[PDB]
Ligand binder design. Structure first.
Ligand SMILES: COCCO[C@H]1CO[C@@H]2OC[C@H](OC(=O)N[C@@H](Cc3ccccc3)[C@H](O)CN(CC(C)C)S(=O)(=O)c3ccc(N)cc3)[C@@H]21
Ligand SMILES: [Cl-]
Ligand SMILES: [Cl-]
Ligand SMILES: [Cl-]
Lengths: 99, 99
C-alpha cells in the first residue's frame, strides 16, 4: 500500500497470535512494543528518544506480521508510550519513503 | 526521491537561514529541532516520546525547505537529541510510505 501521513500511520500487526496496533516509524532504528510476553531468552538494551533513555528486553528472531507482510526479527519490549515498528522490520517488508 | 530505510533517513533542511541535518520521522506528529532562534511569537509545549517529556517552544507558520521542497508549518524547538521532521511537514512535501 501507499500510506500518507495526514494521520498517524497506525497498522495492525500480529505477534504471538495476537493482533496489536503499531506505528510505522522511520525515525526508530528498532521495533519496540509495550509490555507483553515473548518466548525464549532476552538480552538487555538501552534505547534513547525524546525524553531520555529506557531499558528494554531484546528478543531476537521473533515472527511478526505487519500489515499482512511477514517478518522475523528483533523485537524490543518495554515501557514505550506506543508500539512502534522501526527500520529493522520496515526493511523486511520492503518499505521506502517517497516524495 | 525514493529513500531507502537501510540507513536512517537523514536529509538537509533549510530553516531560519540555516542548513541543518534532520531525520524524516513518520512516528513524530510534530517537527522538533535542537535549540535555535526563530522569529515571531511562541508558546511553551510539552512533547513526549520514549523516555518521557521535554519542554519546547512552539513556533507557528515557519517556512522550511526539505530536500529542495518548500513548506510552512509549526516547528518545536528544545532539547531533542536529534532534529526530527514530523508528519506536520512531511505531508506538505508529499511524503508517503510505500511497500
Ligand atoms: C506522546 O504523545 C503522543 C505523541 O508523542 C510523540 C508522537 O508525536 C509527537 O511528535 C514528537 C514525538 O514523537 C516521537 O517521539 N516519535 C518517536 C516514536 C514515538 C511515538 C509515540 C510515542 C513515543 C515515541 C520516534 O518516531 C522514534 N523515537 C526516535 C526518534 C525520536 C529519534 S523513539 O520512540 O525514541 C525510538 C528510539 C529507538 C527505537 N529503537 C525505537 C523508538 C511526539
Ligand atoms: Cl532485526
Ligand atoms: Cl503545522
Ligand atoms: Cl496527499
Amino acid at each position: 500500500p501507499q500510506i500518507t501521513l495526514w494521520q498517524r500511520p497506525l497498522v495492525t500487526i500480529k505477534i504471538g497470535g495476537q493482533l496489536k496496533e503499531a506505528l510505522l516509524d522511520t525515525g526508530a532504528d528498532d521495533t519496540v512494543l509495550e509490555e507483553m510476553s515473548l518466548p525464549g531468552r532476552w538480552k538487555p538494551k538501552m534505547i534513547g528518544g525524546i525524553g531520555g533513555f529506557i531499558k528494554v528486553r531484546q528478543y531476537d528472531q521473533i515472527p511478526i506480521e505487519i500489515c499482512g507482510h511477514k517478518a522475523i526479527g528483533t523485537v524490543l519490549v518495554g515501557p514505550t508510550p506506543t508500539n512502534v515498528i522501526g527500520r529493522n522490520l520496515l526493511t523486511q517488508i520492503g518499505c521506502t519513503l517517497n516524495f
